[PDB]
Design a protein around this ligand. Structure first.
Ligand code: A1ART
Ligand code: A1ART
Lengths: 306, 306
C-alpha cells in the first residue's frame, strides 16, 4: 500500500541526452539512432527571438555550426533539417543506447514523466500532466530546453513532450517530438496567455478510487447522481465535463472497489460543495488530478517494465 | 521556475536490480561488483516468519538454494553470508554496470529516491523522506522487498535504504545497506508500532523559502521571533525543535531571498496559528516537509549529475 506521484524509471531516456550548442546558445537534445532532436530556437540569437524567420535563419547555417556533445565525446553533424518547431541534426555515429521507442502525441489529461536536464546531464525526474490548456506545471530553469516527457510501456519509450518556453505565469509550453506545439503557443518572444485552466475531472475520480483502495473511506456516501446532475455541479466548480467515455475508463477501478462510478461522482459532488473540513485524502488537502485511471491501476497492482 | 517533488535520475541504480528467489520466496536484490544484496527474510518460509532464528536457518541452506536472475541471465552463487539483517550472495560474474557508489546511513529528515521494483524490474521512482520515527511513507506492494533508496552526488550513488516490511498503518520500514534497520523494528512477524511522528520543521522552512524564490509571498510578515518563542509554538503543533544548526543550514536560502531565518520562523508560527484560509503554497494546501534545504538549492539552481 501507499500512493505516490510516481515517475517511470528514467534509465532508457538518460542514455539519449546530449548537449547541443549553436552560436551563443546551449540546450538539450534527444539522440535516437543517428538523429539528434532539439528546439529550433537553438539557431536564434538574442536580438532575433522577438520575431524570427526560422526557415530563413536556418538556410544561413552550416553543419559545423552545431556543437553536439555526447558526454565528453563530440558528435559530427552531417546534415540538418527543420520539422515544424524541432531541429533534426543527422550525425555520423548511431546511438548504441537507443531504446525501442515511439513518438506519440497525447491528449490533455494524460500524464508523463519529465527528465529535467542541463547541458545534456539529467538533474531529476518528476511526474506531470498535460493541462486542459496545453500547459504543464513543470520545474524548469535556464538551459532546460530539449528535456523531454515520456511514458514507458513494457520496453518501449513513448516520447510525448519536448520543452521550449516558460509562460509569464510560470507554467510551461513545449511540443511533441515532431515539433508541433501543444496549444496555441509559438517559439517567438511576444505576449502569450496560457488560457484559463479547468480540473481534469476523470482523474480526480481515479484518485478517489486510489484512496478507497488504500483504506481512506471517510468520503463515500449513500447518495447517487446522474451524469447530467453531476455535470451541472462540476461546471460551477470549473471541473471538466465527465463523458460516457470517462465512466467507461473508470470501469475496472469501480469493479475493484465495489463503488459504482456514478456513486463516486455523488461523492465528489459533496466534496466540492462541502470542502474537506480539515480531513485529507491520500495525504493531501486538495483534490488531486494528475493521476490517470491508468496510473492508479499500475501503482496499485505492481506493473513493471523491461 | 516551478517546484516539484523531484527524484534523482534512476539510471545508475536500474543497472543493479536483480531477482532473488529462495524456496517459495522471490524478492529484489542490489548487484554491485560480484555481490548481490537482499533482505535476509528471503530464507524464511511462510510458517517461519512468526519468530525465526536467521543464523540457524541460514546454516541449513547451500549456494544452489538461491536463484539469482540478472535479466534473463542466471547468476551463480559461490558464497553467502549474513550481515545484521541483509543477505550477501557472492556470484561468479561481476556486474559491469556498477556505478561509483557508497553505503551511507542517513538521519531522519533526509530525503532520498526510491526505485520500486518487482521481480528485479523497476516499476517507478519517487521521492521519500526518513520520518522522525524511522518510517517512510512509500508505495510498496507484494514483492517490493529489496528495492533501495538512494541519493546521487555528481557520479556517485549513495545507497541509504533497502525495503523490508509494511507496518499495520501502511507506512514502511527497512534497513541501511549494511543491514541495520532504521528505528526499533525487526524482521519478525510480531506486533510493532511505528511510534508517533512529528513534522520536520527545518524542512517546512526550506519549502517556504522555495515558495518565496518562486513568487509566492502572501505569507511573509514583519513580525520576528526568537528560537525559544518559536520552539514553544512548534511543540503545540507537534513540529520538531529548531536547533541553532538548522538556522545555519538555512543560511544560503535566507541569503538568496533576503528573509532572515528567524523572520521566516515567525511566518510559520502565524501559519500554524491561523491555518491557510483557503490559500495554497507551491500548489499545496498543507505545510510540506519532504524537502531539505539541499533539495531547494538543487532544484532552484539547476545542479545535474554525471
Ligand atoms: C529553455 N532552454 C528556456 C528555459 C526557460 C527559462 C526558465 N524556464 C524556461 O523554460 N526557454 C527559453 O528560453 C524560451 C525561448 C526564448 C525565451 N524563452 C522563454 O521561455 C522566455 N519566456 C517568454 O518570454 C515566453 C513568451 C512570452 C514568449 C510566451 C523566458 C523564460 C522569459 C526567458 C523562446 C521563447 C524562443
Ligand atoms: C517485501 N517483499 C514485503 C512487501 C510488503 C507487502 C506489501 N507491502 C510491503 O512492504 N514485505 C513483507 O512481506 C514483510 C516480511 C514478512 C511479512 N512482511 C510484511 O511487511 C507484513 N507486515 C507485517 O506483518 C509487519 C509487522 C507486524 C511484522 C511489523 C505484511 C505486509 C502483512 C505481509 C516480514 C515482516 C519478514
Amino acid at each position: 500500500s501507499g500512493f505516490r506521484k510516481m515517475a517511470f524509471p528514467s534509465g532508457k531516456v538518460e542514455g539519449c541526452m546530449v548537449q547541443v550548442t549553436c552560436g551563443t546558445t546551449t540546450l538539450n537534445g534527444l539522440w535516437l539512432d543517428d538523429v539528434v532532436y532539439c528546439p529550433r530556437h537553438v539557431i536564434c540569437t538574442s536580438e532575433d527571438m522577438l520575431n524570427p524567420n526560422y526557415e530563413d535563419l536556418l538556410i544561413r547555417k552550416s553543419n559545423h555550426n552545431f556543437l553536439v556533445q555526447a558526454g565528453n565525446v563530440q558528435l559530427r553533424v552531417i546534415g540538418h533539417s527543420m520539422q515544424n518547431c524541432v531541429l533534426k541534426l543527422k550525425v555520423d555515429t548511431a546511438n548504441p543506447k537507443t531504446p525501442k521507442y515511439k513518438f506519440v502525441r497525447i491528449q490533455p489529461g494524460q500524464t508523463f514523466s519529465v527528465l529535467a536536464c542541463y547541458n545534456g546531464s539529467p538533474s531529476g525526474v518528476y511526474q506531470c500532466a498535460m493541462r486542459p490548456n496545453f500547459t504543464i506545471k513543470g520545474s524548469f530553469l535556464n538551459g532546460s530546453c530539449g528535456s523531454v516527457g515520456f511514458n514507458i510501456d513494457y520496453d518501449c519509450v513513448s516520447f510525448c513532450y519536448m520543452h521550449h518556453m516558460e509562460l509569464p505565469t510560470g507554467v510551461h509550453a513545449g511540443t511533441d517530438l515532431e515539433g508541433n506545439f501543444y496549444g496555441p503557443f509559438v517559439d517567438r518572444q511576444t505576449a502569450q496567455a496560457a488560457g484559463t485552466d479547468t480540473t481534469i475531472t476523470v482523474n480526480v475520480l481515479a484518485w478517489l478510487y486510489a484512496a478507497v483502495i488504500n483504506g481512506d473511506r471517510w468520503f463515500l456516501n449513500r447518495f447517487t447522481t446522474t451524469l447530467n446532475d453531476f455535470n451541472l455541479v462540476a461546471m460551477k466548480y470549473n471541473y471538466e465535463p465527465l463523458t460516457q467515455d470517462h465512466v467507461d475508463i473508470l470501469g475496472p477501478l469501480s469493479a475493484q472497489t465495489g463503488i459504482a462510478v456514478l456513486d463516486m461522482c455523488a461523492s465528489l459532488k459533496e466534496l466540492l460543495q462541502n470542502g474537506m473540513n480539515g480531513r485529507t485524502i491520500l495525504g493531501s488537502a486538495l483534490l488531486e488530478d494528475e493521476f490517470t485511471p491508468f496510473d492508479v491501476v499500475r501503482q496499485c497492482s505492481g506493473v513493471t517494465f523491461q
